[PDB]
RNA sequence: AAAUAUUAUGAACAAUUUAAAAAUUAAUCUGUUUAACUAAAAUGUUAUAUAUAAUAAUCUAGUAUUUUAAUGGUAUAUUUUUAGUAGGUAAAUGAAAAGUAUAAAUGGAUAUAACUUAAUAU
C-alpha cells in the first residue's frame, strides 16, 4: 500500500476499473464510455480516444 | 429492597427485572479492592469490630450480576452490602531476617500481619436511573425503545483492503440478537 | 473459595467475536448511483487533463 | 512521563476541607475556631454507641508487659505490701551493672 | 555537512531522555513566567475577580467551579456593605471581653460551663472533635 | 551476637542431607534463605507480581480489541479507580463486567466532572440581624444536612423535611 | 534532623490513647 | 555491554553506549568466511590515517 | 519412547518409526471416504446397522485420542440415520432398539451426541431402554433430559422385575448406578437408590457376596438412622455428641 | 524435601526423550486449547515468529499462569514465503559453538533457508520464547512442540480445523496527514437571513 | 546512550517480566478530547447497552453468560453447516454445550470417562467378554 | 532535594520542603520570591490570588485572612 | 448503606447534560503552557484532574469517607491515623491562612513592592522591563548563601575591573518594547 | 539435546506424518477400484 | 556551647585562579552497606543503510533520474512524589518473685563465643 500510494495510483470503485488477473489496469466499458461523454470536447481528446473507446465498448 | 426507579416507566419494568439473582460487589475496603458476592468470605486488614456483629461496606465501586453491571465513577450509591465479623486474629507470620555482613548484626522482625475475616451475608442493589445513554454519539437518549438498538454494529470489509487478513465468514457477517427484547 | 457470579472466562466465550465498525462503510464492488458516476469520472478527468 | 505538567493545587485539593472544617460558623458572622491542633493530643478512640463496644485486641506496647513489682512510691505509701527482701531495691538512680 | 552528520553521533542521551529535559526546561521556564508576576493587583469592588486576568482551549479544567466563581460578579459592592457585614462579625475564642448590647440574660457558654469544660461530641470517623482542650493553651 | 539459632533450628526438617543432619550447615543454610527471601520480599517480588497482573489484564483487554495502555489511560480519564487485582479478577471471574468497562471506556461518555469547590451561599451576606429567629445560612446549611441525612438509605424517619427540621417544636412545652 | 511536618505523619501510640471505661451506677442503688 | 545473540544484537552494537563511529555500520565485515588470524570482526571507513 | 525417538549416534534405530498400521488404517479410511466421491457407499450398504455401530466403535477405539475422524464420524452417522428413518417403519424389535441405544452410547464416547437419536430414544415409549442409554446419557449436563432418563430407568427396572430376567436386571443395575452418580441431586438419587434397592442387588450379584448383602438388607433401617445429615463439621459433630 | 535424581533421562539413553504434547503431568493441560492457522505470506520473520509464540505460550489468554504450560497450538504456513526487510537473509548470521576447539559455525539465514527454512522459524520461535521462559528446561522445551511449520500450504491438521490468525501490525502510523482543501458549501439562511 | 566515556559499564540482568502489547497510534484521534483512545467495536457492542445513573455512574446491561456462549455456539454451527464438522468442531460443541449447562465445577479430566468406557468400543471375542452387568449371577 | 548542594536544601528547607513531592503554601514576599527564584528548578510553583484563595476555600468576601490568622490558636 | 462524595458538602456540577445535547468533556491534553509538543494526559494526570492528589488512596473520596459502618447505622470510631490525617488537613488550612494574613499585613505596612521579583531575578531575566526613577552562626550562613547564590557570573574585568569599582551600564539601544521577542 | 538435534527430535515424526498424508492421496486411488501408479 | 576521653590511614607533576581546571592526554575523591507487612507507584538503552549524496548517458564539458523523516514534532504504556494495617518515639549498656526458697508431683532461668581446649562421629 506504501509503494501504491507512493507511486500515486488511486483505489477506484469496481465499477470504474480494476487490476485484472494479470495485475493490468482494465477499465469498465461503462467507465469508458462516461469518460468519453465527459471529455468529447477537451483539447486533450483525439481519434485514437474514440478508437479505444470503441475498443473497450 | 432491589427496586429499580426511573422517570420514565417503560425502562424501568424493562430494567427492573433484570436486577433479579445473585450479585458481585466490588468494594473498597482497608486500602483493598475485594470482589465479594453473596456467600463468601474475605479476610481484610484489621477493623476494630468485635466478632459476631453486622456491618455495611460503605465503598462500593461497583455492583453487577448475571443481567447488569452498574460502573460506579469512581463509587457506587444506594448499594447495601452487609456482612457479619466472624473473626480476628493475626494471619500468618512474616519473618524478616536483616543482617549486614560487614557488622555482627541480626535483627530479627515478626510480621503477624492481623486481620478481621468476614462473611458477606446480603448484597442489595436500587439503583436510581437517569436515561438511556448513547454510547457513540454521547448523549442521553429522551426516548427509549428496547426493540432497536440504540447503537448498530457493522462489518469491517470494504474490499479495498488486498491484504487485509480474512477471517472466517460466519464470523465476520454474524448478527447479534435483542436483550432487552 | 474462588467463585463467580456471572461465570468464569472460557477459551470459547469471546472466540467467535470479530471486530465491527462503528458506521456504513462504502464497499469496493458497489453499484454506484448516477451522482457516484458523475463525480468518480469527473475526478478521473480532472486527474487525466493534468497529466496530459 | 514523569514530568507531569498540571497545576500544583490539584497536588492538595481543598474539596473535602473547606473553611467549615476550621470555622463550623463562618457561613455564619461567627469565627469559632475548632482544630486539632497537633496528632499528639489524641486522647483514643471512643465508643459511638453503648451497644457497639471496642475490641479487646491487644497491641505490642500494650500486650507485652512484664508483672508490677512494688516500687518505693508503693512501699511508702502503704507499707504493708513491704513483704520480702526482693521488695527492699537500691535507689532508682542506679541502673545496674555495666 | 560532514560537522553536522558527525555531531548526529555525539549525543549523550536517547531521544526520550532529550524529551524528558526539555520538559524540564520548560517547567523552569514556566515557574520563571510565574515570578515575573507583580505582587499585588489593583481591583475594584463592583468588577469580578476574573476581569484582569492575563490569560489546549475549549476543554474543561479541573478549576471549572473556581473559574465560574472569579467571573459571577462580586457580592460586596460598596465599602458601606462591607463594614456593615463586618461590625457583625464575632469573634468567640477572643482574648478580652465581650458587650451585652442586644440581651441580657443570654449568658454565655463560658460563662455557662466554665472554661475547663466542653460538651461531649460524638466521636466518629465522619466527626473528629479537638480533643485534649488543655493542650490547645500554647 | 545474635544468629536466631534456637528458633532456625527447628526448621532443619525442611532442608535435606548434611544441612539436616548437621547442625552448623543448616543453621547456615536456613539464615542465608532467610536473609535472601526477605531482600526478594523486600525489592523484587511486587515487581514480577504486578507485571503478571499487568500482563493478564493486557491479554484480557486484547481479547477484546484494545492493549492495557489505552485501557489504563481511559480508566483513569473516567475516574473508575479500578486497581490492576481487581481489573484482573474481572476479567477472569466477570467477563461481562470487565467487556462493559471496555465499552465504558471506548465510548464516547462524558466523564464525570470534577470535584467542586464548596460555595458559600448568598444567605451569608445578609444583615442579621437586620434591625429570636435562626441565621439564614445556619437554616440553609441544616436543611442540607436534614435533606443528605434522608438520601441515604431508607429510614423511618420519612422522606419529608419539614416536619423532621420541626422537631424541636414537637419536643417544646406549649406554655 | 528536625522534622518539618510538611507530608502527612501518622500519630504515634501512646498509653495515653487507651480506651477508658465508664464509671457505671450499680445496680442496687 | 552485550544484551543479546549475534542474530538480534550484533558484535558491534556493543559499544552504541559510546559516542562516534561505533553508532554507525562499519564498512567491512570479516565475520563471514575464514576467520581472521587476529580476530578482527569489523573495519570502519578510514579517517584520514586513523582506521578503527 | 522407544518408538518416538531416534538419535543419529544410533540409538533406537530398530524400534522407532514403524510404520505397522499406518497403511492399513489409511485404505481403510479411503474406503468410507471414497463414497463420498462416488456417491453412493457400497460398503456402508453392505453393512448391517450392527455392524455399522461395531464398524463405528472400531475406528473411534483405534484411533488413540479415542476419538474417530470426523469425516469418517459423520459418514457413518449419516448412513446409519438414514437406515433407522428408512427401516424403524417396518419391522423394528427391541434388539434393533438395543443397536440404537448402543450407537448412541458410541457417539456420546466419540464426543459427539447425536440429538436426533437422543430425541428419538427419549420420545419413543413401549419399549424400556437398555444399559447403554442410560450410560450415555449420564454424561450430559441436561437437568429436563436427566429428569426423563431417571423415569425412564425406573420403568426399565419395573419391566425387568417383573419379566425376571436378571442379566438386564443387573446390567440396568450398573447403568443406574452410573446414572445415579452423575445425577446433580444427591436427595432424589440416594431415594431412588435406596427404593430400588441397588445395594442388595448389586451385592448379591457378586461372587461371595451374599451373607453380607443379606445382612445389609436386613440391617439397612439402622445404618440409614446412624448416617449424619449433614457431612460438614464432623469434628464439631462428633465434640457436641461427647457433650450429649 | 524435594529432589531431582540425578539419574536424568539423556538423548543416548534408549527410553530417549519424551514429547510434551504426550506427557501427562500437573502442570500440562490440553482441554482448553484452540488450533490457529498462521499465514506466513508477505510478513516479516521476527514479527511472524513474536506473533506465534504469544499463543504458544498462552500470554494471550487472560488466566495465564507462568508456572502451568496451557497455550494454544499454531500451525504456521507458507514458510517459504517469510520475508526479510533488505538484504539481510544474507547479513544476519546464525552462531553456535561445540564442546570443540574451533568447532564454531556462523552461517547465514539464506544458509539456513537452503538446508531447512523451517528452522529458521524454529530459531526465531526459540529466541522468543527463551525471551521470558529461559529459567527452566519445561518451560523452554513444552511450547516449541506447539508449533507446526510446513514450508507449503499442505498440512495434515485438517481435522482440527484451525482458524485461520489475524493480527494486526502496530506500525500504522502515517507520520503525518495534512487535510485536503475543499470547495467550502454555503447555506442559504447563512447570509444574514 | 547512558553509558558515557568516563564511566564503567556493568551487565545488567535481562528484565524477563511479561510485557503489553504495543497498540497503533492515532494522532488526530488521540489529540481531540472527545474521543478516547481506546477503539473496541465488536459483535456483542449493540447487546452491550449503556444507561446513565443519578449518582454520575453508568448502568451497563448485558446478555448473560449462557446467552454470549449460545450466540458463539450458533456461530459455530453457522461456519461447520457448509463442509460438515470435524472432531475439533464437535468436541468444542459438546464442551459448549457443558459449559451453557453445567452449573457446576468440574475437577475430572475429560478423557476418564472414555477410558473407562473403552471396553464399549473395543470387542473381545473369547469366552471372557464384558457387557453391562457381568457376574457369575448371570453366567 | 538532597542530590543538589547543601545551599539549595537550605533555601528549601526555608521553603519547608524536606523531601520529594511535598507542598506548600507561602506569600508572595520577596524573601520567598527570592527562595523560589534560587530553587526554579527542583520546584514547580503555582499562584492563587488572595480572592482566588478566599473563593477556593469557604469563606465569605467580608472576612478577611487576618482575622482568621488571630482566630488560630 | 454506600457513600459517595467528591466534596465536603456532596454537591457536584450537573454529571449528564439535558436530553439531546452534545455533552462537555475535559480537556484531554496535559496542561503545559506551550501549544506544542501536545501530549495525552496521563493516568496520574486524570487522577489529580478528579481530585485524588497522584495515586489512589489519598486526598480522595477512597480515603475520606468511612470505611465501612454497622448494620443499624452506627459509625465506626476515630483511629490514630484518622485524626493525624485531619491534623494534616487543618495544616494546610493554616498554612493557607498565614500565608494570606502575612501577604495581607505586608499589603497594610508597604512592604510590597512596585517592581516584580528580586534584584537578582531582574538582574539575570532580560523579560522583564527595566523600572527607573543568641547565635550569629546561623546569621553568616545565610549571608555567604546570599553571597554564592547572588550573581551566578560576573561581567569579564576585561571591560569592568570589579576590582578597581567598576561597572558596566545597561545598553539598551537595541531592546525591544514587545515582549513577543522572548515569548516565541 | 541441542538445537537441531531437539528440532529434528520434533520433527521426523511429522515429516513422516507428511509423508503419509502424501501417501493418503495415493491410496485414494486404489480405493476407487482403479489403481495407477504414481506417474512422474 | 561547656566538662571530659582518644586521634599517623599518611599523594608527586601540570593547568587555572586578586572570576570560573572547562586544557577530556584534564576528574574535582573517603567507599560501601542502609528496607515491618499488604497493596500503590510516573524511568526512558531499538535501527533508519541517498542529497555537497546515490544511480546513469552524451561528448570535447553539459545533463538526466532518485522515495532528501522532522529536529520539540509524534501520543499512551513500562521499577521508588502514596495509603491502610501493624505499630511509643528521630536505631548498639540482659532478661528473668523459684536458693535472693517455705515454695516441695506436672516451675520448660533456656540461655545465644561457627576459629587456639578435650573427647567423639564422619
Ligand atoms: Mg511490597
Ligand atoms: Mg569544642
Ligand atoms: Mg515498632
Ligand atoms: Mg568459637
Ligand atoms: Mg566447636
Same mark, same amino acid.
Given at each position: ?57 | ?181 | ?52 | ?29 461567627? +469565627? ?5 491542633? =497537633?496528632?499528639? @493530643?489524641? #486522647?483514643?478512640?471512643? &465508643? ?28 511508702? +505509701? ?5 513483704? =520480702?527482701?526482693? @521488695?527492699? #531495691?537500691?535507689?532508682? &538512680? ?5 | ?138 | ?175 | ?29 | ?52 | ?244 | ?193 | ?139 | ?73 | ?184 | ?40
Amino acid at each position: 500500500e506504501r509503494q501504491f500510494h507512493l507511486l500515486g495510483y488511486v483505489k477506484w470503485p469496481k465499477e470504474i476499473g480494476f487490476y485484472n488477473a494479470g495485475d493490468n489496469f482494465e477499465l469498465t466499458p461503462q467507465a469508458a464510455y462516461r469518460i468519453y461523454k465527459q471529455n468529447c470536447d477537451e483539447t486533450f481528446w483525439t481519434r485514437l480516444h474514440n478508437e479505444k473507446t470503441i475498443i473497450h465498448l | 429492597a432491589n427496586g429499580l426507579r426511573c422517570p420514565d416507566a417503560l425502562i424501568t419494568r424493562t430494567l427492573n427485572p433484570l436486577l433479579n439473582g445473585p450479585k458481585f460487589a466490588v468494594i473498597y475496603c482497608g486500602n483493598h479492592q475485594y470482589k465479594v458476592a453473596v456467600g463468601d468470605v474475605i479476610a481484610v486488614q484489621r477493623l476494630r469490630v468485635e466478632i459476631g456483629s453486622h456491618i455495611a461496606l460503605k465503598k462500593v465501586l461497583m455492583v453487577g450480576g448475571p443481567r447488569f453491571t452498574a460502573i460506579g465513577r469512581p463509587l457506587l450509591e444506594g448499594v447495601r452490602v452487609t456482612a457479619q465479623v466472624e473473626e480476628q486474629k493475626r494471619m500468618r507470620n512474616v519473618v524478616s531476617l536483616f543482617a549486614t555482613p560487614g557488622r555482627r548484626h541480626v535483627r530479627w522482625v515478626d510480621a503477624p500481619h492481623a486481620a478481621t475475616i468476614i462473611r458477606i451475608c446480603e448484597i442489595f442493589y436500587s439503583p436510581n436511573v437517569v436515561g438511556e445513554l448513547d454510547k457513540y454519539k454521547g448523549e442521553l437518549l429522551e426516548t427509549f425503545t428496547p426493540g432497536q438498538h440504540t447503537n448498530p454494529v457493522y462489518p469491517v470489509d470494504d474490499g479495498y483492503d488486498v491484504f487485509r487478513k480474512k477471517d472466517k465468514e460466519a464470523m465476520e457477517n454474524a448478527t447479534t440478537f435483542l436483550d432487552l427484547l | 473459595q474462588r467463585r463467580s457470579v456471572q461465570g468464569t472466562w472460557n477459551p470459547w466465550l469471546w472466540n467467535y467475536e470479530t471486530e465491527r465498525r462503528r458506521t456504513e462503510a462504502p464497499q469496493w464492488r458497489r453499484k454506484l448511483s448516477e451522482k457516484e458516476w458523475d463525480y468518480y469520472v469527473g475526478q478521473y478527468s480532472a486527474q487525466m487533463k493534468q497529466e496530459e | 512521563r514523569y514530568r507531569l505538567f498540571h497545576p500544583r493545587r490539584e497536588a492538595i485539593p481543598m474539596h473535602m476541607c473547606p473553611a467549615k472544617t476550621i470555622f463550623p460558623l463562618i457561613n455564619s458572622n461567627n +469565627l469559632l475556631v475548632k482544630t486539632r491542633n =497537633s496528632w499528639e @493530643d489524641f #486522647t483514643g478512640r471512643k &465508643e459511638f454507641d453503648e451497644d457497639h463496644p471496642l475490641p479487646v485486641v491487644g497491641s505490642r506496647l500494650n500486650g507485652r508487659t512484664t508483672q508490677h513489682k512494688w516500687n518505693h512510691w508503693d512501699q511508702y +505509701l502503704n507499707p504493708q505490701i513491704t513483704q =520480702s527482701i526482693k @521488695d527492699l #531495691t537500691p535507689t532508682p &538512680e542506679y541502673v545496674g551493672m555495666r | 555537512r560532514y560537522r553536522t552528520a558527525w555531531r548526529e553521533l555525539l549525543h549523550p542521551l536517547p531521544v526520550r531522555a532529550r524529551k524528558m529535559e526539555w520538559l524540564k526546561r520548560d517547567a523552569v521556564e514556566e515557574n520563571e513566567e510565574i515570578l515575573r508576576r507583580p505582587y499585588y493587583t489593583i481591583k475594584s469592588y463592583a468588577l469580578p475577580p476574573a476581569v484582569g486576568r492575563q490569560e489546549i482551549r475549549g476543554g474543561m479544567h479541573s478549576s471549572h467551579s473556581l473559574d465560574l466563581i472569579m467571573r459571577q460578579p462580586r457580592r460586596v459592592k460598596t465599602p458601606e456593605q462591607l463594614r456593615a457585614l463586618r461590625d457583625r462579625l464575632r469573634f468567640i475564642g477572643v482574648t478580652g471581653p465581650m458587650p451585652q448590647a442586644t440581651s441580657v440574660s443570654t449568658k454565655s457558654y463560658t460563662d455557662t460551663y466554665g472554661s475547663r469544660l466542653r460538651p461531649r461530641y460524638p466521636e466518629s470517623w465522619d466527626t473528629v472533635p479537638p480533643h485534649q482542650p488543655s493542650r490547645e493553651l500554647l | 551476637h545474635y544468629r536466631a539459632k534456637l528458633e532456625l533450628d527447628r526448621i532443619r526438617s525442611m532442608l535435606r542431607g548434611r544441612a539436616r543432619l548437621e547442625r552448623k550447615v543448616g543453621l547456615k543454610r536456613l539464615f542465608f534463605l532467610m536473609r535472601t527471601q526477605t531482600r526478594y520480599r523486600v525489592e523484587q517480588q511486587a515487581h514480577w507480581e504486578r507485571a503478571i497482573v499487568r500482563k493478564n489484564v493486557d491479554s484480557a483487554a486484547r481479547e477484546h480489541g484494545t492493549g492495557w495502555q489505552h485501557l489504563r489511560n481511559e480508566l483513569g480519564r473516567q475516574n473508575v479507580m479500578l486497581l490492576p487485582r481487581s481489573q484482573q479478577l474481572l476479567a477472569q471471574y466477570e467477563p461481562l463486567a470487565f467487556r462493559a468497562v471496555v465499552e465504558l471506556c471506548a465510548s464516547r461518555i462524558p466523564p464525570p466532572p470534577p470535584p467542586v469547590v464548596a460555595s458559600v451561599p448568598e444567605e451569608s451576606y445578609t444583615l442579621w440581624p437586620p434591625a429570636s429567629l435562626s441565621h439564614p445560612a445556619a437554616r440553609v446549611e441544616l436543611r442540607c444536612g436534614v435533606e443528605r441525612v434522608l438520601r441515604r438509605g431508607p429510614s423511618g424517619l420519612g422522606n419529608n423535611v419539614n416536619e423532621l427540621i420541626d422537631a424541636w417544636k414537637e419536643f417544646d412545652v406549649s406554655p | 534532623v528536625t522534622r518539618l511536618y510538611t507530608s502527612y505523619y501518622t500519630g504515634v501510640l501512646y498509653p495515653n490513647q487507651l480506651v477508658q471505661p465508664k464509671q457505671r451506677l450499680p445496680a442496687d442503688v | 555491554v552485550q544484551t543479546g545473540s549475534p542474530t538480534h544484537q550484533r558484535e558491534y552494537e556493543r559499544f552504541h553506549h559510546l559516542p562516534g563511529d561505533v553508532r554507525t555500520r562499519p564498512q567491512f565485515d570479516f565475520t563471514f568466511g575464514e576467520t581472521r588470524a587476529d580476530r578482527v570482526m569489523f573495519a570502519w571507513r578510514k579517517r584520514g590515517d586513523l582506521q578503527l | 519412547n522407544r518408538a518416538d525417538y531416534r538419535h543419529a549416534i544410533g540409538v533406537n534405530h530398530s524400534t522407532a518409526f514403524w510404520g505397522t498400521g499406518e497403511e492399513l488404517y489409511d485404505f481403510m479410511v479411503e474406503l468410507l471416504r471414497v463414497e463420498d466421491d462416488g456417491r453412493i457407499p457400497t460398503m456402508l450398504d453392505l453393512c448391517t446397522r450392527e455392524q455399522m455401530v461395531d464398524l463405528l466403535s472400531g475406528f473411534c477405539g483405534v484411533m488413540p485420542c479415542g476419538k474417530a475422524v470426523g469425516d469418517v464420524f459423520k459418514t457413518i452417522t449419516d448412513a446409519f440415520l438414514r437406515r433407522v428413518r428408512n427401516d424403524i417403519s417396518g419391522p423394528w424389535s427391541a434388539h434393533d432398539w438395543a443397536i440404537v441405544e448402543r450407537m448412541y452410547l458410541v457417539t456420546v464416547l466419540c464426543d459427539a451426541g447425536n440429538n436426533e437419536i437422543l430425541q428419538l430414544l427419549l420420545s419413543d415409549t413401549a419399549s424400556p431402554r437398555g444399559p447403554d442409554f442410560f450410560a450415555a446419557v449420564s454424561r450430559t449436563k441436561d437437568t429436563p433430559t436427566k429428569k426423563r432418563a431417571l423415569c425412564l430407568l425406573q420403568e426399565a427396572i419395573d419391566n425387568a422385575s417383573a419379566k425376571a430376567d436378571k442379566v438386564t436386571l443387573l446390567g440396568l443395575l450398573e447403568s443406574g448406578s452410573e446414572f445415579l452418580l452423575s445425577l446433580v441431586d444427591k436427595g432424589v438419587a440416594h431415594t431412588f437408590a435406596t427404593q430400588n434397592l441397588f445395594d442388595y442387588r448389586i451385592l448379591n450379584s457378586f461372587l461371595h457376596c451374599s451373607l453380607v448383602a443379606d445382612r445389609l438388607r436386613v440391617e439397612q433401617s439402622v445404618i440409614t438412622s446412624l448416617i449424619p445429615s449433614s457431612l460438614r463439621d464432623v469434628q464439631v459433630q462428633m465434640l457436641m455428641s461427647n457433650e450429649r | 524435601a524435594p529432589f531431582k535424581s540425578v539419574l536424568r533421562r539423556h538423548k543416548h539413553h534408549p527410553e530417549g526423550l519424551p514429547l510434551y504434547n504426550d506427557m501427562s503431568k500437573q502442570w500440562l493441560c490440553r482441554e482448553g486449547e484452540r488450533w490457529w492457522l498462521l499465514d506466513a505470506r508477505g510478513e516479516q520473520l521476527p514479527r511472524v515468529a513474536a506473533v506465534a509464540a504469544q499463543y504458544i505460550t498462552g500470554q494471550h489468554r487472560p488466566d495465564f499462569t507462568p508456572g502451568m504450560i496451557t497455550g494454544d497450538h499454531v500451525v504456521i504456513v507458507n514458510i517459504k514465503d517469510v520475508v526479510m526487510v533488505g538484504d539481510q537473509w544474507i547479513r544476519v548470521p546464525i552462531t553456535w559453538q561445540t564442546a570443540y576447539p574451533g568447532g564454531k559455525y556462523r552461517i547465514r539465514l539464506t544458509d539456513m533457508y537452503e538446508r531447512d527454512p523451517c528452522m529458521l522459524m524454529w530459531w526465531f520461535l526459540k529466541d522468543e520464547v527463551n525471551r521470558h521462559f529461559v529459567r527452566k528446561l519445561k518451560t523452554r522445551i513444552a511450547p516449541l512442540e506447539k508449533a507446526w511449520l510446513y514450508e507449503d500450504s499442505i498440512h495434515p491438521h485438517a481435522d482440527k480445523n484451525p482458524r485461520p490468525l489475524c493480527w494486526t501490525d502496530p506500525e500504522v502510523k502515517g507520520w503525518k496527514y495534512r487535510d485536503p482543501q475543499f470547495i467550502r458549501r454555503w447555506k442559504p439562511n447563512e447570509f444574514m437571513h | 546512550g547512558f553509558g558515557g566515556f568516563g564511566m564503567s559499564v556493568y551487565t545488567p540482568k535481562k528484565d524477563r517480566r511479561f510485557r503489553v502489547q504495543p497498540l497503533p497510534s492515532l494522532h488526530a484521534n488521540s489529540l481531540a478530547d472527545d474521543t478516547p483512545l481506546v477503539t473496541t467495536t465488536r459483535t456483542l457492542s449493540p447487546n452491550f447497552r449503556a444507561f446513565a445513573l443519578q449518582d454520575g455512574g453508568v448502568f451497563f446491561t448485558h446478555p448473560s453468560h449462557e446467552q454470549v456462549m449460545r450466540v458463539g455456539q450458533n456461530i459455530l454451527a453457522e461456519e461447520t453447516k457448509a463442509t460438515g464438522m470435524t472432531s475439533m468442531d464437535t468436541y468444542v460443541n459438546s464442551r459448549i454445550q457443558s459449559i451453557i449447562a453445567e452449573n457446576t465445577v468440574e475437577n475430572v479430566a475429560l478423557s476418564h470417562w472414555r477410558r473407562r468406557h473403552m471396553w464399549n468400543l473395543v470387542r473381545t471375542h473369547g469366552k471372557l467378554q464384558r457387557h453391562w452387568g457381568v457376574s457369575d449371577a448371570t453366567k | 532535594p538532597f542530590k543538589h548542594s547543601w545551599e539549595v536544601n537550605r533555601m528549601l528547607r526555608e521553603l519547608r520542603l524536606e523531601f520529594k513531592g511535598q507542598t506548600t503554601i507561602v506569600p508572595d514576599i520577596p524573601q520567598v520570591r527570592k527562595r523560589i527564584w534560587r530553587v526554579r528548578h527542583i520546584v514547580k510553583v503555582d499562584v492563587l490570588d488572595l480572592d482566588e484563595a478566599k473563593a477556593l476555600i469557604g469563606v465569605p468576601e467580608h472576612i478577611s485572612f487576618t482575622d482568621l490568622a488571630s482566630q488560630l490558636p | 448503606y454506600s457513600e459517595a462524595r467528591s466534596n465536603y458538602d456532596g454537591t457536584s456540577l450537573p454529571a449528564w447534560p439535558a436530553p439531546g445535547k452534545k455533552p462537555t468533556y475535559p480537556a484531554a491534553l496535559s496542561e503545559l503552557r506551550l501549544p506544542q509538543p501536545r501530549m495525552r494526559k496521563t493516568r496520574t494526570e486524570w487522577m489529580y484532574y478528579h481530585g485524588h492528589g497522584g495515586c489512589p488512596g489519598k486526598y480522595g473520596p477512597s480515603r475520606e469517607i468511612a470505611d465501612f459502618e454497622y448494620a443499624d447505622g452506627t459509625p465506626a470510631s476515630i483511629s490514630g491515623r484518622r485524626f493525624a490525617f485531619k491534623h494534616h488537613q487543618d495544616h494546610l488550612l493554616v498554612q493557607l491562612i498565614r500565608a494570606a494574613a502575612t501577604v495581607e499585613r505586608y499589603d497594610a505596612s508597604g512592604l510590597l513592592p512596585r517592581i516584580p521579583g528580586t534584584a537578582e531575578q531582574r538582574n539575570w531575566d532580560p523579560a522583564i522591563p527595566l523600572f527607573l526613577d543568641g547565635t550569629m552562626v546561623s546569621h553568616v550562613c545565610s549571608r555567604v548563601v546570599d553571597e554564592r547564590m547572588g550573581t551566578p557570573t560576573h561581567t569579564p574585568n576585561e571591560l569592568a575591573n570589579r576590582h578597581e569599582g567598576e561597572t558596566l551600564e545597561a545598553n539598551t539601544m537595541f531592546a525591544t518594547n514587545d515582549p513577543s521577542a522572548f515569548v516565541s | 539435546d541441542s538445537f537441531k538435534e531437539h528440532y529434528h527430535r520434533v520433527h521426523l515424526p511429522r515429516r513422516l506424518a507428511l509423508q503419509r498424508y502424501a501417501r493418503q492421496q495415493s491410496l485414494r486411488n486404489a480405493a476407487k477400484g482403479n489403481v495407477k501408479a504414481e506417474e512422474v
